[PDB]
């Protein structure tokens, strides 16, 4: 037992919100940030979500907080509630999400219709005039 | 453990060779001797994050093959294709894609 | 002329040789002389499992035969 | 007497139209100069081993 | 032997892009009618190591007023990233087997623009940060259609998992299922790492060049493992080794060539060449990669 | 003793590396920088010695001035090779950047290079041949081949 | 309740509390902001895996995609205020006053 | 009808990418729903066994289901291998 | 050759350009007038190279 290893990366996380929440010379907290979220993705991976990690630091990491730094350069206790069985031969993280276009009809049609109207409130919004 | 050693591996090497290179020649010595704020950058910034966003929700379509549901599916996928289609149509006939 | 520019590439072309030539012998040598097994989806983990816990040393690798059931 | 030199009508025929078409998509007159370059690497170079070699001269 | 396997994993690569600025030097003077370096070893051949010698022996200019954590920061995350890059790779087999692999490549390319940022934002100049966020805009811009392609490629492949793709190519290689892909997809790992035609912009500086020929030879590996599949013996890998190892050493060489061949574009020039003809066609081509498999009852089975 | 040995070997291999691998920025300044591109044309083909075509001036090893320097342009030649890593060296090319040459005698134009920077080579002519040059590059290798800094440092 | 939950609510807690001091650099209130979302994730994944509710592996995706466009909004107002003034000072912001 | 074939024609010319894009989209939007192995796939969907077959308790009145693999009764695979 | 170039920029567009030329200003036209006409002529050989 490796000390605890998530509550070692708990703490890491919460020592990095501390770090970013003092506001400092925004880069820098972007950094801290960055680090967080990065600690947070080791955390969901260690934990068995794959998929949701990766989307985690693929999605988060290198476009929202890259478009955040793009746009700030442009300025001036644990292993005893886990399970006991298997999964089967597929893992139930990856047929949950892909039940999205089986099940989540409805959620994939408002997704769909509130990314179209942030695309364009985005361009009115930034027309200016 | 293997990916966390192979990391650490991999870093510590970088580490490692990035600082002799900027010491080796630290220790002989030597002599020792705006505004503008361009929008239509930021445009190509927001439109990359909500073209990743709508391709982070396009991600699942390899497990979404084996379903049973298969018209429903791939109405639906037809779906987000089209609406992506159709922000990037919007964004080019409002002036969006210029320079 | 243009073999001149083999050596480079020969060179280049071990090199990256090397990679995959040594991760298939680690394999084989720390797999009893097979290929490493590949544990996705969670049963055949517990298939590798199962075999460690057979084998009698510790040790998935070491196959129990027809040999083993008396 | 005097020439032109970008003074001609590109054909408005189907055929024409498909041609240019086939020449956007497939990328033709990239890998005819792609070709040109690779044909152009496998000719003898001009360049003579100085110092052990002199450049011509004259008296 | 864990420490083994990740070492001869890593020095290898380090020493093929060393070899392969000889032969990039090679390659472009034999096609200018001259010859590369041939003085400095009997055929070039220490040419390498005599540039790296002098590189590590150069002063440092230090801006003397910017950042040195960013500063120094910058190369390590490069390096590390780019020696990342080649783990999950299957040649034939993974030094780490991910169920993602793909997945973790293309994070890991997603992660790739913070050294460009965080080197243009503490070189303390203005000019060379409008460099960096020009750089930064067209990377993310391709890495768009790069993970549009790249899934409408997997959808045939059933997952991604990388050493899926090798049964997959069993009998045919993916670049006849579907080349317009694959051409998209070699344009767009063009203006990934800002070769030419899309090359518009002493220690670190090695460390930085280091690792873009690391990204080079790693997207060139990803490209031949993805649409040129060699066939593998399990009884012998020795020969899908060598295979994948001279396909990725012909798409090399084809980089090479095309910086050789061609002029460059402007920067709107290749913004337009991507927004408004790369991903209609990526988006058109994905519709029908979602639509074929349904139609031609041809699924692939992992799920 | 070994001593002595040691330096001396490091020394010579450093001294290889130096040479065998010379990175220049040369200033254009006039038609000597016709005669300095036939000297990188197939014929002599300068980057099969180790001589890279055109490089910045922020990894540059050597400065080679190419024409005349002129009164307006001296500052600004002066803030390049201030910019330089120190192991440089500059190489004066034709008669205008060695002496002023044809136009010594005028109001405008500053009588040779080496008023404003160091030369460790003058490569004589109008122009100089891209093979004089050539020469004076190889020149300036065994000049380089000849220096030993680790054996001043060892007997200092 | 374990005491992994109990970090990434005082994660989340430690976010909004940053949030809600504005020294300045409004900047960073939209970084609080992403933390807040960061952390809301993360203990929701936790939250959904750790039961075995298969069906919700959709909803962080969706809690994702959503405020990843909440925050290219703010990032367009911080923007526009910056061309405004200048600056995304908050100070800046007292022309509507109670 | 004239006026639809000088606008293909215009746009074919000047603008292959957009002809070509909106092409291949119509066609993998129209042709799954006429093609006739769209079947073919849902069944072998179907016949995927993830999940282990659950056996019934035999009450004398399921003449249906085959008491040993090897019955003929149950759902044949016949026609999966003969494609 | 060698050019100092003074523009002024909106956004990517060009608005002004100014080159600032003499930089290679050897005051041949002065020169040649201490030159007899064979004695001048070299200098049309490095007027245009
Ligand atoms: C009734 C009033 C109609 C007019 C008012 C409309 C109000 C706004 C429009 C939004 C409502 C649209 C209704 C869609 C509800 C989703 C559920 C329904 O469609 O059934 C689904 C069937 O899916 C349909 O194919 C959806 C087709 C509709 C989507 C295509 C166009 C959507 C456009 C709607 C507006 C969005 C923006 C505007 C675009 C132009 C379920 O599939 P099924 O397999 O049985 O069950 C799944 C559960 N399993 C897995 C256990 C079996
Ligand atoms: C694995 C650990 C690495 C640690 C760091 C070391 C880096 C790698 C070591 C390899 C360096 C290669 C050295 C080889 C240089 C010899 C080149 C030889 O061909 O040059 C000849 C010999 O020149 C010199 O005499 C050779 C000096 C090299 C030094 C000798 C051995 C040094 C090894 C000491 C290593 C200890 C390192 C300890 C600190 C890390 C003459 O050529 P040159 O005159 O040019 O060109 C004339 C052109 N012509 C012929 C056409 C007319
Ligand atoms: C940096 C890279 C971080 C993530 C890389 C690994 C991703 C991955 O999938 O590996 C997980 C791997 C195998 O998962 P599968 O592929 O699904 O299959 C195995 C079971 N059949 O198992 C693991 O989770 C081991 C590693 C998890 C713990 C560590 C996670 C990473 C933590 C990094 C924290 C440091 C971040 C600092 C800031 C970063 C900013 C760039
Ligand atoms: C592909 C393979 C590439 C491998 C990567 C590169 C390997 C690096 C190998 C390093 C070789 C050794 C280099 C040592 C020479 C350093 C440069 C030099 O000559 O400095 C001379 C300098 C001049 O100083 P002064 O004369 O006093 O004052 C002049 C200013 N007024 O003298 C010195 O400082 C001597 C320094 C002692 C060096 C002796 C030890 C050699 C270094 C071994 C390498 C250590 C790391 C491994
Ligand atoms: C019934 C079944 C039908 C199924 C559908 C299949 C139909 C497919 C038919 C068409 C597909 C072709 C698409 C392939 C890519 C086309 C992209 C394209 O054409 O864009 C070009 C631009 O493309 C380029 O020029 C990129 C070249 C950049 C230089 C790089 C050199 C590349 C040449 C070397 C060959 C590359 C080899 C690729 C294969 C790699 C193998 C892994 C348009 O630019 P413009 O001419 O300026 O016109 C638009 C403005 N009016
Ligand atoms: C119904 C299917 C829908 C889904 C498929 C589409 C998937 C992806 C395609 C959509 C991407 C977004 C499209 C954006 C549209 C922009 C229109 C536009 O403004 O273009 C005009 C120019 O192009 C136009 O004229 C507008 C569209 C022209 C018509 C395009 C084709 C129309 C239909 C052709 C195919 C019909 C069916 C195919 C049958 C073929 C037989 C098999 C302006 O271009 P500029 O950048 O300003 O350059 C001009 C300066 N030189
Ligand atoms: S040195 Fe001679 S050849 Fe060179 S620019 Fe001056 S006059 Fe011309």
Redesign the interface.
């Known amino acids: 037992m490796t000390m605890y290893i998530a509550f070692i990366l708990s703490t890491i996380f919460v020592i990095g919100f501390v770090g970013f929440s003092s506001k400092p010379s925004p880069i820098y907290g972007g950094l801290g940030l960055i680090v967080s979220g990065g600690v947070g993705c080791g955390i969901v991976l260690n934990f068995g979500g794959s998929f949701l990690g990766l989307m985690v630091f693929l999605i988060y990491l290198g476009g929202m907080l890259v478009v955040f730094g793009y746009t700030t350069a442009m300025a001036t206790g644990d292993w005893v509630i886990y399970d006991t069985g298997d999964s089967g031969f597929f893992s139930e993280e990856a047929m949950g999400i892909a039940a999205l276009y089986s099940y989540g009809t409805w959620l994939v049609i408002v997704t769909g219709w509130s990314l179209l109207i942030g695309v364009v409130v985005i361009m009115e919004i930034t027309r200016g005039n | 453990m293997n990916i966390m050693l192979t990391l650490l591996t991999n870093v510590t090497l970088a580490s490692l060779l990035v600082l002799i290179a900027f010491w080796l020649p630290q220790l002989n010595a030597y002599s020792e001797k705006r505004l503008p704020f361009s929008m239509k950058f930021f445009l190509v910034a927001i439109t990359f994050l909500l073209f990743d966003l709508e391709i982070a929700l396009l991600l699942p379509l390899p497990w979404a093959s084996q379903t049973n549901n298969l018209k429903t599916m791939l109405t639906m996928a037809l779906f987000l294709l089209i609406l992506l289609a159709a922000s990037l149509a919007y964004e080019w006939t409002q002036k969006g894609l210029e320079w | 002329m243009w073999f001149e520019i083999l050596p480079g590439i020969a060179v280049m072309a071990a090199c990256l040789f090397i990679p995959g030539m040594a991760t298939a012998h680690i394999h084989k040598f720390t797999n009893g002389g097979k290929e490493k097994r590949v544990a996705h989806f969670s049963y055949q983990w517990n298939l590798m499992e199962r075999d460690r816990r057979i084998s009698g040393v510790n040790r998935y690798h070491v196959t129990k035969g027809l040999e083993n059931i008396d | 007497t005097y020439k032109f030199v970008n003074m001609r009508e590109p054909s ?1 025929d ?1 055929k024409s ?2 041609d ?2 086939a020449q ?2 497939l ?1 033709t007159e ?1 890998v005819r ?2 070709g ?3 044909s ?9 081993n ?2 052990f070699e ?2 011509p001269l004259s008296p | 032997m864990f420490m083994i396997n990740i070492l001869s994993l890593i020095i290898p690569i380090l020493l093929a892009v060393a070899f392969l600025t000889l032969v990039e030097r090679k390659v472009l003077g034999y096609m200018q009618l001259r010859k590369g370096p041939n003085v400095v070893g009997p055929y070039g051949l220490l040419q390498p190591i005599a540039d790296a010698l002098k590189l590590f022996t150069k002063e440092p200019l230090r801006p003397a007023t910017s950042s040195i954590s960013m500063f120094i920061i910058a190369p390590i995350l490069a390096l590390s990233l780019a020696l990342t890059m080649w783990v999950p790779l299957p040649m034939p087999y993974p030094l780490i087997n991910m169920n993602l692999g793909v997945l973790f490549m293309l994070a890991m390319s997603s992660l790739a623009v913070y050294s460009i940022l965080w080197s243009g934002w503490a070189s303390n100049s203005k000019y060379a940060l409008i460099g960096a966020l020009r750089a930064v805009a067209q990377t993310i811009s391709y890495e768009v259609t790069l993970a549009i392609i790249l899934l409408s490629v997997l959808l045939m492949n059933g997952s991604y998992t990388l050493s899926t793709l090798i049964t997959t190519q069993e009998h045919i290689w993916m670049i006849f299922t579907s080349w317009p892909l694959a051409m998209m997809w070699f344009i767009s790992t063009l203006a990934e790492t800002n070769r030419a035609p899309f090359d518009l912009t002493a220690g670190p500086f090695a460390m930085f060049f280091m690792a873009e020929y690391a990204n080079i030879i790693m997207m060139n590996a990803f490209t031949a493992i993805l649409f040129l599949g060699a066939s593998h013996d399990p009884h012998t890998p020795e020969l899908y080794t060598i295979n994948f190892v001279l396909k990725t050493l012909a798409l090399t060489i084809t980089f090479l060539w095309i910086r050789a061949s061609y002029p460059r574009f402007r920067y709107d020039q290749l913004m337009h060449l991507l927004w408004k003809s790369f991903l209609p066609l990526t988006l058109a081509l994905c519709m029908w990669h979602i639509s074929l498999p349904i139609m031609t009852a041809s699924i692939p089975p992992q799920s | 003793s070994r001593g002595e040995y040691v330096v001396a070997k490091l020394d010579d291999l450093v001294n290889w590396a130096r040479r065998s691998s010379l990175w220049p920025m040369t200033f254009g300044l006039a038609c000597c920088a016709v005669e300095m591109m036939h000297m990188a044309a197939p014929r002599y083909d300068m980057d099969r010695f180790g001589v890279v075509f055109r490089a910045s001036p922020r990894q540059s090893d050597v400065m080679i001035v190419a024409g005349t320097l002129t009164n307006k342009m001296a500052p600004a030649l002066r803030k390049v090779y201030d910019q330089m890593p120190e192991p440089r060296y500059v190489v004066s090319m034709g008669s205008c950047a060695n002496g002023g040459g044809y136009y010594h005698y005028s109001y405008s134009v500053v009588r040779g290079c080496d008023r404003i920077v160091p030369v460790d080579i003058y490569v004589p002519g109008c122009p100089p041949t891209a093979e004089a040059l050539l020469y004076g590059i190889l020149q300036l290798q065994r000049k380089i081949k000849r220096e030993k800094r680790l054996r001043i440092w060892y007997r200092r | 309740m374990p005491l992994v939950y109990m970090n990434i609510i005082m994660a989340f807690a430690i976010a909004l509390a940053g949030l809600l001091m504005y020294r300045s650099h409004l900047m960073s209130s939209l970084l609080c902001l992403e933390g807040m979302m960061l952390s809301l994730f993360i203990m929701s994944t936790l939250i959904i895996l750790n039961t075995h509710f298969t069906l919700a592996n959709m909803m962080p995706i969706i809690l994702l995609v959503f405020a990843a466009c909440e925050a290219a909004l703010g990032l367009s107002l911080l923007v526009m205020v910056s061309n405004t003034y200048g600056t995304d000072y908050v100070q800046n912001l007292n022309l509507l006053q109670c | 009808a004239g006026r639809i074939a000088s606008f293909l024609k215009n746009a074919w010319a000047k603008e292959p990418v957009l002809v070509a894009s909106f092409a291949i989209g119509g066609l993998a939007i129209i042709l799954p729903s006429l093609s006739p192995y769209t079947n073919y796939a849902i069944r072998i969907n179907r016949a995927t066994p993830y999940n282990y077959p659950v056996p019934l308790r035999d009450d004398g009145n399921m003449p249906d289901v085959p008491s040993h693999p090897q019955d003929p009764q149950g759902p044949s695979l016949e026609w999966l291998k003969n494609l | 050759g060698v050019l100092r170039l003074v523009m002024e920029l909106s956004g990517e567009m060009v608005r002004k350009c100014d080159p600032h030329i003499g930089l290679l200003h050897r005051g041949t036209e002065k020169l040649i007038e201490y030159k007899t006409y064979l004695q001048a002529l070299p200098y049309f050989d490095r007027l245009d190279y």
């Not at chain 4, 690497?41 to 360049?47: D, G, K, N, S, V």
Request: proline letters at 7%.
């Open positions: 408005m189907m139209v498909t240019r078409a956007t998509l990328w990239l100069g792609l040109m370059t690779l152009y690497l496998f000719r003898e170079p001009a360049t003579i100085y110092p002199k450049g």
